[PDB]
Amino acid sequence: LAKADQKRGKKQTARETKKKVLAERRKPLNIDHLNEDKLRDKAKELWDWLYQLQTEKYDFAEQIKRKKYEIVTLRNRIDQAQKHS
Amino acid sequence: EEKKRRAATARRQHLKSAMLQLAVTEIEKEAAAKEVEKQNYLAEHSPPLSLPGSMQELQELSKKLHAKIDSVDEERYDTEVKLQKTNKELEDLSQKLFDLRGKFKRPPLRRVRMSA
Amino acid sequence: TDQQAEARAFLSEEMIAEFKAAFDMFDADGGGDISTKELGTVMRMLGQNPTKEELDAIIEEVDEDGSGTIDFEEFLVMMVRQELANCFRIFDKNADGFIDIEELGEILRATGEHVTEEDIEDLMKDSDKNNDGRIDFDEFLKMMEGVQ
Ligand SMILES: [Mg+2]
Ligand SMILES: [Mg+2]
């Protein structure tokens, strides 16, 4: 049962906390049927943001291959520091 | 009485001088490269898009844009997650090292805060 | 008073006339002083937000004669202590976090200074204290010490 209130009441606790920080930077696509050359600048605006979203990513990523490393080093710097003597 | 051992280190030092002198320049390459491995890898998940003519198509393209946008941001999320996640792990091995060895964790705290 | 010497060497023109006018916002009457109850109102006054367990301590370690001041002497002393992880990466290279006889062989062969299969197996005998055949980062900051 401790595997059904720990891992069960934490990932679900992650979901809302997940889905939530999402319906806000998510500006409802309102503009439906008005004028013609708005989309212009606009498309690349939603895009410009679009671009962003994504761009923040790789950064978000590669910064992980750095620590997945800094990690090891440490880990070993830890397995090189034991010695019961 | 091994005296001539003033040049064997000189080297080793005059030497280690070479070691670093290498990695240094090697630092800003894997970067100006990691700089391109970047934009090159980026040129396509959403390339130099274009603007059509008039009607029913723009209205749509959008849909997807916003559509995948979430498809994107989503993964952008799974990220900061598996990120802060892998962010904490390091910090839990941060504690393991100081208390046994004696290195301390004061360094990271101060600097980082402001930016993020 | 020995600290004050190196201490003044560190100070160069664009930050001796600067570490002045504000440090002064601590003194008050030609005769030598400076205070510290504005020790925190000025730290940040330069971009340093010291927590209060880092604001009660900065008050518990400094000042010991009674002058209840702090000049430009024992001052810029409390203003120095407040890439070797890089090179490890451009040397460790392969991700095993370690660096053995060959890679070093490599790097020591990846440079421009002449060396030998004899200039290599001699260096490995000085940074690997524990005795093994690699060099923990721990022993990566000790050999590489003194070098640029
Ligand atoms: Mg290796
Ligand atoms: Mg070692």
DSSP letter for each residue of C55-102: TSHHHHSS--SS-----SSSSTTTTT---TTTHHHHHH-SSSS---HH
| Residue C53 amino acid letter | E
The pair of structure tokens assigned to C148 is: 């640029």
- Tell whether B31 and B68 lie within a shared domain: no
As a whole number of angstroms, the distance between CA B71 and CA B1 comes to 73
User: How are the residues of chain A apportioned to helix, strand and coil, as percentages rounded to the nearest 5?
Assistant: 65, 0, 35
Name A64's Cβ contacts closer than 8 Å, sequence gap at least 6: B82, B83, B86
Q: In 3D, which of B9, B22, B29, B6 has the Cα closest to residue C113?
A: B22
Q: CB of C90 within 8 Å of any CB in chain A?
A: no
Tokens of B111: 């600097």
Tokens matching residue A18: 């997940």
Q: Do B62 and A70 touch (CB under 8 A)?
A: no
Please state the domain count of chain B: 2
Q: Which of A76, A81, A83 sits opposite C97 (nearest CB)?
A: A76
Instruction: Find residues 100-139 of chain C whose CB sits inside 8 Å of chain A.
Output: 130, 136-138
Interface contact flag, A80 C138, Cβ < 8 Å: yes
Residues B73, B107 share a domain: yes
CA atoms within 13 A on the CB side of C133: 1
Across B23-105, where does the E strand assignment appear? none
Q: C94 C-alpha to center of ligand 1: Å?
A: 6
For the record, the structure tokens of A34 come out as 């008005």
Both B101 and B74 in a single domain?
Answer: yes
Residues B111 and B74 in one domain: yes
Specify the length of chain C in residues.
148
Query: Smallest Cβ distance to B46: which of A18, A39, A51?
Result: A51
- The residue of chain A nearest to residue B74, with distances taken between CA atoms, is A22
Alpha-carbon gap, residue C100 to C96, rounded angstroms: 10
Fold agreement (C1-82, C83-148): yes
Show Cβ contacts of residue B51 under 8 Å, excluding neighbours closer than 6 positions: A40, A43
Residue (of C85, C96, C107) closest to C132 by Cα position:
C96
- B66 and B99 within one domain: yes
Q: Is residue B41 situated within a structural domain?
A: yes
Measure B54 CA to nearest chain C CA, in Å: 53
Closest residue in A to C132 (Cα–Cα): A80
Rounded CA-CA distance C14/C16 in Å is: 6
The three-state secondary structure class of C142 is coil
Inter-chain residue contact B22 with C119, CB threshold 8 Å: no
Running DSSP on this structure, what letter comes out for residue B9? H
Domain count, chain A: 1
Solving technique for this entry? X-ray
Block residue for tokens 């500006």: A27
CATH code assigned to C1-82: 1.10.238.10
Is B33 part of a structural domain of the chain? yes
- Separation in Å, CA A9 to CA A14, A16, B77, C86: 9, 12, 20, 41
Phi, psi of A16 (to 5 degrees): -60, -50
Tokens read off for B50: 């274009």
Structural domain of residue B94, as residue ranges?
60-116
**B74, B80, B93 ranked by CB distance to A60: nearest:** B80
Q: Is residue B50 part of a domain?
A: no
CB contact at 8 A, A51 and B46 = yes
Look at chain B and count its residues.
116
Give the domain range for residue A39: 1-85
Q: Which fold has domain C83-148?
A: Recoverin; domain 1 (1.10.238)
Distance C102 CA to ligand 1 centre (A): 8
Are B106 and B64 in a shared domain?
Answer: yes
Cβ neighbourhood burial of C137 (10 Å; 0-12, 13-18, 19+): buried
A25–chain C nearest CA distance, Å: 31
- Phi first, then psi: what are they for A41, rounded to 5°? -35, -45
Q: Tell if the CB–CB gap between A81 and C138 is shorter than 8 Å.
A: yes
B37 with B70, same domain: the answer is no
Q: Which of A26, A46, A57 sits opposite B70 (nearest CB)?
A: A26
Q: Spell out which residues of chain A touch residue B93, defining contact as CB-CB under 8 Å.
A: 71, 74-75, 78
Instruction: Give resolution in angstroms.
Output: 7.0
The answer to whether the beta carbons of residues C104 and C123 sit under 8 Å apart is: yes
Which CATH number covers residue A49? 1.20.5.350
* C-beta of residue C86 within 8 angstroms of C-beta of residue B23: yes
**CA C136–ligand 1 middle distance (angstroms):** 11
CA distances from A65 to A4, B30, B39, B44, B115 (A): 33, 13, 18, 22, 21
Whether residues B40 and B76 fall in one domain: no
By residue count, chain A amounts to 85
Long-range contacts of C24-29 (CB under 8 A, 24+ apart): C26/C69, C26/C70, C27/C69, C27/C71
| Domain spans, chain C | 1-82, 83-148
